[PDB]
Point group: D2
Chain length 307, copies 4
């Protein structure tokens, strides 16, 4: 179900910090019309860690209802530990999600044994939905063990992984190991990279979950097509262009803001400039970008956007 | 006033994973009767990260109502980011908490400027309650900047800090800076250490928040008293005894379980052995301790308890 | 001068821990006959951190003398701080090295300012030799700042970098930034990856410094050729084969040995099996591989060697 | 016997970067006259990582010959791996060192089994000299396993450890384990901390190796004495004073220099200000302190020196 270009949908906000439902609908259309293959609701690029449980449910329902079956929707169920995650799986089921995306436990100290039990219990709560393990060491401070991942795949517990480690050699070793084990169809491997998607496809990955795909969905859809057609030199040239668009995330001055403010902020500034969302408002405690910063971001978008 | 010995209350559970309210009340009594100065509900040792919001609210109300004004109760509001933390501040207000304990944002990438804003916004949600910043880099993966903390203390936003960095030198430097800045009364510094409480007090800390104090509250109360009396050599001797009881956290085999399972499992095993709580049950996905592991814990408890 | 396939030559040893000069000569021939473009003497795969200064000088002179001008030789000058490095630059000059390879300071706490001064002083000691900065965070615990690297390149202080960070996205951003700055010819970027060389070339890297290229030099030379001819699908297939040969490094049981023992040990076991070196002896305090381990390694080499 | 106050001797330099032997002798006198119990030559604070082997041998011989048997001198043999360390053990033997100080292997990836073998081989090169293991994770990026250390102590391979982890709780646990294992006399535990020496002594450490002791050797000698007399509150007061002198390491602006430049530069600046050494020169690539920075260091020295 979940292969190809699957952006982690952003959550547009109003200045009061509420979900901008009408902007979220327009963003959904932007993604779908840009040729994506699926949507991942309630990921990190969705500000899931910033939204309340009620706000998550509204965003997820908004995305599902507006998508209207055009592409499949998977739901993040990111929370510190199993019981809390399983509450969110209940929420996702109620909303009509077609997949789940969970990380290892976090805040708490964990262990591969406990990570394994965690995934098994989450799958048991919704055994008919494909569960993907989201490998995001920068946020959870554990790396998902590839041997564990493949055992769970064999057991029908995991349908795949979204890998945002930034380690292309590790993702490549995982694809090789999966293929060697005969688990190619059973375990989809999607990169979270925004800048090395060509590489992932060249190694036989199944797709990509790129936050920058909110801004330029058609660029990623075109890149995937070029890779699937074996047009590698062309793919690398388009990826280079994408990588220059990505400079929007480096505009914000991180001497006084987090990489989240600068990066998600850059993406939201780009979206507002293109008239897809009303505002670049971010959840507390994100820092605002300056008028100089936003002007800079606009110019980059005008230069390197693919459409 | 949150000074002195202020344990982070555990959450006893039934085998089914539900909050055991009856065992929780007995634990509260055990602590208060052991001479503690306050209680910290919904900390890490309380399994706050494992409890649902609804379970946390049941644990918090259980502790506040059973305490019945005997000592003050501060509430953890541990969540990833500001809006989610403020929901829990509202819950704490509804329950009648007398203080708040919050960490930096986590999951998300953060920055000192955002951490500062976070604490300002939390304090704004409940400005009548003392807000303590909880420095726990092992869990949140940010270290709270001591200059920021003292800036917030001066502004009336923070009442103190609970420091579980495990870095005694850094905690000492913070105390010294606080004192040199004239903020001694405004900003209470409590150590989260279980094994270096005497050192904290020698350096002029205001108290301690020790997980092991759930098992042996009277030992920590006695230790604090020794320090406040200036009986440092006696304090160090008692601390050494405490540090041998603390071996209960090192019994669980961490080749197949997390440190949380061994450490919190050890404390709960001790508690059940002492008859304070019904079961050593732990929230999913913690691993069970074996009957051998539990028997070794019982032996340590029997030898080293105060 | 230093582009293409440039293996970090190993140092064969005898059981007494002395340099096996006759095996080193045979290894040099193996590399050169396998079609490499250059040799990097006294790198990490050379056990430079284990050899005494006298032993380093012997290995370096042995490699230079035996190479007999067939391909160019660059010399590692790895030491904790500037003055110590500059002693080794004297040694390299005396041996007739054609290039230098230095890391940031280590053991000591450092800073980008001090890293910059360090490279400037090393270059000033041998201004006619191309100096490459070796980015190896796992060993020196600093990451070389790409802005610093390009400023030094502009200033004629650095000729290039050998990047063993394992971060393909970072190396790609560095290549893009170099190209954007107009520094393409002035600053050669070589990957230390053994498993993502195709990716490096697809992004426009200048070559590769692969330890596994000691074992299978012709595989890497063939892979570089395939990439330079634009034969990307073929390159990825050969890289996959190379990546299975690489399993030799995962045989050793790291429950009782370092990754150095298992990995360099695997390479030396492979070399001895192929009859290129006399023994798989490693420097103290490396742990020996077992007879079961060595048998395993032999079987992998027999299956996946390219020649 | 390497117990007590044992500073890691600095290496004074001329502006040209050569060892200033005359200033080094005066520094040796300063230390010995300040009441230290021993000297540790070619440590980190000695700029060992910046000196060539030939310079290290000149510094070591200078210190041993000038000391003239007044207190014992242990020698650092800091190098990446075993063969290179053993070359330096030979140099130390030639110079007449009375002890050796070695770290885990570095640069290379290592493992506890290899660390163990490393120390065994170093001890085998000079089995008559006490070998101390130097735990400095910030520089070597391995933590020495305490079970390994006590195994080696039992086997006669290690005489002790100099612990600069900055982790007081871990150092305390090591002392407790050592004592419980009956290895108290066989394995001396010295802290590298400059600011938590009182805590180390309270827990029964054997001494201290403080960089700041180059500047103020009498303060550390006085502090050790207070602790050994059981005057803990006095010790903590003196430690606090020391910790204010220690602000000299925080003057250099680390936006454009390493911690080594600020910290070692601060100590050398203090030393030159006191007239003990000719210049505050530092080995390449350390950055210079500004005349403002130096003047602020002088002010701190003037206020807080013992």
């Amino acid at each position: 179900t979940f292969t190809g270009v699957i952006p982690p949908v952003m959550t547009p906000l109003h200045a009061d910090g509420s979900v901008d439902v009408e902007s979220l609908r327009k963003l959904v259309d932007h993604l779908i019309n840009g040729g994506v293959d699926g949507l991942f609701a309630l990921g990190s690029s969705g500000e899931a860690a910033f939204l309340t449980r009620a706000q998550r449910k509204l965003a997820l329902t908004t995305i599902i209802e507006h998508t209207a079956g055009r592409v499949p929707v998977t739901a993040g169920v990111i929370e510190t530990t199993t019981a809390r995650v399983i509450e969110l799986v209940e929420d996702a089921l109620e909303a009509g999600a077609e997949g789940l995306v969970a990380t290892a436990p976090f805040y708490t100290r964990t262990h591969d044994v406990e990570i394994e039990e965690h995934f098994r219990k989450i799958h048991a709560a919704a055994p008919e939905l494909p569960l993907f393990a989201f490998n995001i060491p920068v946020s959870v401070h554990s790396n998902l063990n590839p041997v564990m991942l493949l055992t769970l795949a064999k057991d029908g517990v995991l349908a795949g992984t979204k890998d945002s480690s930034g380690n292309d050699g590790a993702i490549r070793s995982l694809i090789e190991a999966r293929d060697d084990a005969g688990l190619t169809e059973q375990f989809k491997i999607l990169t979270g990279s925004e800048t090395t998607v060509d590489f992932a496809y060249l190694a036989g990955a199944d797709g990509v979950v790129p936050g920058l795909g909110n801004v330029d969905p058609a660029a990623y859809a075109a890149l995937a097509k070029l890779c699937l057609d074996g047009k590698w030199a062309e793919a690398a040239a388009l990826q280079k262009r994408i990588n220059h668009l990505f400079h929007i995330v480096f505009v914000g001055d991180t001497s006084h803001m987090s990489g989240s403010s600068a990066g998600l902020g850059g993406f939201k500034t780009a979206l507002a400039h293109l008239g897809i969302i009303e505002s670049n408002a971010m959840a507390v405690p994100h820092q605002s970008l300056s008028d100089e910063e936003t002007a800079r971001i606009h110019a980059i978008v005008d230069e390197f956007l693919y459409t």
